[PDB]
Amino acid sequence: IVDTCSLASPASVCRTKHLHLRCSVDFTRRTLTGTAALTVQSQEDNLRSLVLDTKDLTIEKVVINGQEVKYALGERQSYKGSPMEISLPIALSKNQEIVIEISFETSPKSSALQWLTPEQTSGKEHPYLFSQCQAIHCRAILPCQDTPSVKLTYTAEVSVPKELVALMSAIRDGETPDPEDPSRKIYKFIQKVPIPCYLIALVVGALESRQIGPRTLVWSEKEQVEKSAYEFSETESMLKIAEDLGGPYVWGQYDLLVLPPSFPYGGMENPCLTFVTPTLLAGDKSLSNVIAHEISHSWTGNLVTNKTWDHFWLNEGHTVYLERHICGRLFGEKFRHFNALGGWGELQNSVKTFGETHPFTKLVVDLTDIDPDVAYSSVPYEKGFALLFYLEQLLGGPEIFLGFLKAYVEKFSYKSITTDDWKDFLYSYFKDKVDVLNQVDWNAWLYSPGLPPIKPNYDMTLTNACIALSQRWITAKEDDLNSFNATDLKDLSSHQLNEFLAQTLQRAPLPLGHIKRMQEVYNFNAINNSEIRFRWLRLCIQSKWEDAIPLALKMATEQGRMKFTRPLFKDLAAFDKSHDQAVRTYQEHKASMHPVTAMLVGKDLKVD
Ligand SMILES: O=C(CCC(=O)N1CCC[C@H]1C(=O)O)[C@@H]1CCCN1
Ligand SMILES: COc1ccc(Cc2ccccc2)cc1
């Protein structure tokens, strides 16, 4: 009903229908300049003004029907930005529309953008720009109702230096030389499917593409295009599986974009162009589960969207569920349970890090006066998945629940819903099983902190080997280390190898002699898998092995994935032999880190 993260007019007052973006990317000044034409529809009678979200934006003028109108910026409200009130030249009746062209310019401190210098890229000769609007950063790029309760289509014309390429979360609609400047190109984009504004994405740089499917192009710098094309070859197979689970894919194109290492997330479900971290380039497709996850957002998240960020679990919860069904269809049901059981372990970590009582461990959170970037964690992913997984086992198994999910996506397609909307449809769909649903502790699952009230049933086939080897190392004495050998891993996949470290890491610290012996027989230092290397180094740093200090500092700074960089920095700061280096390394790299990551890493290290 009320979006406590937005200062703009609610959807009950007016709602944006379309956005026409005409801007120019200036790497000299690190700014976006142009006009944002918002087609606004009134939701009440005698509407004479509205408020929009902005964050560090410069408003030159606001034109309506070819005339300038009066506008005013309120005082800034911290992360929410500054509200922008506009005086309409006419009063609108209900359902009447008007087009508001706003001339704007971004600040180099835009929390949605990161500007890279040539030395920060692979080619080393051209700059790079990419955007991250989710959750409420789009207001830092252009004025808008920065709330997932409004969905709009958009067309865009972006001007960039001719030697560079621009891509957006839309269907490419041609390129032509800038008629005003021979040194620039203009790339045209159109997104015919209405989306919440947080799915607005832009990227500019020396980008090349490689076709890996009938509807998928992999984009990155020349140095990673081929490496990326192989890593994500399963994309089309996952799109077909996703189509079988959630219905037709309605976005036309599904391209991939591998960004520089400073990308904060593993992936971003930007429509038509998923952004992914280069840390997925393991060389064996072992991390392609993130691709399945991002593909699933084409239904759960982008089609059926959370009305507010309090109900973020709807987006991620069902997305993880779809993702793990896609991997199950590709590698077997036992693999689905293996990952499901592993996700429960991550949920254990998040609750133990926040605390059994922390409000952020609730499935549905109250973000009033809370920066979404500060509450973001695995809770909505795993606790949300555990609920759906719990409901699957409670209502008749995966076949039955997938039927509900497909009907759920068709029921709320192109719309924004709340948790109660989802709960109601669950009761409507399973009307013949309300007696089973009433046995569910909806208050504990949806609004209670800590671990869920009940744990689902997990198959242990693929996990036992991990627990076996993990228990050996934890209980091992000094005269037992000699019996460990590289042969211990001959039948363990990369995922089992990663889960073994996760289980072992839960009982850290280990004796310093155990860690040294582990590297001697297992040689984990030589593994480039970011997931495995991340946990191996955490085990080392937490076990007080000084040799691992430079390794952890290098991984924590040579890439910017918050999943890895934040825990690495925290672990290094808690190690007395590396505390000073950790704070120093952050301070020297702070200026060139991603704006969101730099803020969170500063708070984690208590240097803010
Ligand atoms: O479902 C996704 C991305 C998944 C993503 O990368 N996640 C989610 C938890 C950990 C983290 C990561 O892999 O770095 C998006 C991403 C951020 C908000 N929405
Ligand atoms: C990564 O982008 C997001 C998306 C959503 C949120 C808000 C939130 C966080 C944690 C739990 C519930 C809701 C923050 C950041």
Residue numbers in the entry: 3 to 610
Please give me the paper's original passages concerning this structure.
As an aminopeptidase (AP), LTA4H hydrolyzes natural ligands such as dynorphin, enkephalin, and the tripeptide proline-glycine-proline (PGP), of which PGP has garnered significant interest. Therefore, bi-functional EH and AP activities undergird the intricate pro- and anti-inflammatory regulation, respectively, exerted by LTA4H.
As shown in the M1 metallopeptidase HEXXH-(X)18E motif, the Zn2+ ion was coordinated with H295, E296 H299, and the carboxylic acid side chain oxygen atom of E31826. The OPB-Pro was bound in the AP active site with its prolyl carbonyl group interacting with the zinc atom. The loss of water molecules could afford more favorable binding entropies for nonpolar ligand binding, provided steric clashes are avoided.
